[PDB]
């Protein structure tokens, strides 16, 4: 049943999919690149501002090729963004995840998005910070983004959105997590910028929005 639904959905156009959406959606063309958002506006010595967006809101509304889930090792769901993604995708998402046998910290696995306007969900498991991030934490978080981007490339995905992985109940401090997310995407884009149209940082909390906004230029402009 999940296999059948998956094969059916992946054959459909946006136009067809939009007729069965259970919720409202945000089209990719309504999301400004960083380059456009700054249009209304020294240091020692690639422009990548066309390739990235900072977006505040519910990731499950985004009509993009893939959204990324801040999952746990079981891949079976939970709270926070994981819970939101499972509710919005419907029970076929859990069914496909039950066929996957979990996921390691810093790895990623890809599934169909089912009821989501997103074509795919890329599930990744962030590191857990219980008071400090001086173990493998920083590299583990970077690995989440790298592993997700590997699947982006392998699955011909041209638009992808990331939530603030690990900064919820997994407790990673917000500023260092943002530095890692931005640096990882920057480094990947230097080599792969023709591979995608947009990478969207979907922040949820005002705190993360403020952090990301102060850092976008130092990374991409
Ligand atoms: N609808 C949403 N859209 C975008 N971002 C969201 C949304 N809802 C929450 N966030 C943000 O998503 C970000 C991440 O917060 P968290 O969801 O706790 O994920 P973690 O990686 O720290 O913890 C993983 C565990 O949580 C789950 O139970 C899993 O099953 C795992 O067991 C925060 O910035 C949220 O504000
Ligand atoms: Mg490609």
From Swiss-Prot:
Domain of life: Eukaryota
Chief site of localization: nucleus
Effect seen on changing residue 82 to A: Reduced ADP-ribosyl hydrolase activity. Reduced ADP-ribosyl hydrolase activity
GO biological process per UniProt: brain development; DNA damage response; peptidyl-glutamate ADP-deribosylation; protein de-ADP-ribosylation; purine nucleoside metabolic process; response to bacterium
Catalytic activity: 2''-O-acetyl-ADP-D-ribose + H2O = ADP-D-ribose + acetate + H(+); 4-O-(ADP-D-ribosyl)-L-aspartyl-[protein] + H2O = L-aspartyl-[protein] + ADP-D-ribose + H(+); 5-O-(ADP-D-ribosyl)-L-glutamyl-[protein] + H2O = L-glutamyl-[protein] + ADP-D-ribose + H(+); alpha-NAD(+) + H2O = ADP-D-ribose + nicotinamide + H(+)
Chain ranges of the Macro domain: 44-220
CC terms in the record's Gene Ontology section: nucleolus; nucleoplasm; nucleus
Annotated localization: Nucleus
Effect after changing residue 86 to A: Reduced hydrolase activity
Keywords: DNA damage, Hydrolase, Isopeptide bond, Nucleus, Ubl conjugation
Regulation: Subject to product inhibition by ADP-ribose.
Outcome following mutation: residue 168 to E: Abolishes interaction with ADP-ribosylated proteins. Strongly reduced ADP-ribosyl hydrolase activity
Cross-link (Glycyl lysine isopeptide (Lys-Gly) (interchain with G-Cter in ubiquitin)): 150
Function statement: Removes ADP-ribose from aspartate and glutamate residues in proteins bearing a single ADP-ribose moiety. Inactive towards proteins bearing poly-ADP-ribose. Deacetylates O-acetyl-ADP ribose, a signaling molecule generated by the deacetylation of acetylated lysine residues in histones and other proteins.
Subunit structure as annotated in this protein's UniProt entry: Interacts with ADP-ribosylated PARP1.
Name assigned to this protein: ADP-ribose glycohydrolase MACROD2
Annotated source species: Homo sapiens
């Amino acid at each position: 049943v999940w296999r059948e639904e998956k094969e059916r959905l992946l054959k459909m156009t946006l136009e067809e999919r939009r007729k069965e959406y259970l919720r409202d959606y945000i089209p990719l063309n309504s999301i400004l690149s960083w380059k456009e958002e700054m249009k209304g506006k020294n240091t020692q010595e690639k422009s990548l501002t066309e390739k990235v967006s900072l977006y505040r809101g519910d990731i499950t509304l985004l009509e993009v090729d893939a959204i990324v889930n801040a999952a746990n090792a079981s891949l079976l769901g939970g709270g926070g963004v994981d819970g939101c993604i499972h509710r919005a995708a419907g029970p076929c998402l859990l069914a496909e995840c039950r066929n996957l046998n979990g996921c390691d910290t810093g790895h990623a696995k890809i599934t169909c998005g089912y009821d989501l306007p997103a074509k795919y969900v890329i599930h990744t498991v962030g590191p857990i910070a219980r008071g400090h991030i001086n173990g493998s934490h920083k590299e583990d978080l970077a690995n989440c983004y790298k592993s997700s981007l590997k699947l982006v490339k392998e699955n011909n995905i041209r638009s992808v959105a990331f939530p603030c992985i690990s900064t919820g109940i997994y407790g990673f401090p917000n500023e260092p997590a943002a530095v890692i997310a931005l640096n990882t995407i920057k480094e990947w884009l230097a080599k792969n910028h023709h591979e995608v149209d947009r990478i969207i940082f979907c922040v949820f909390l005002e705190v993360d929005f403020k952090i990301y906004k102060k850092k976008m230029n130092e990374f991409f402009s």
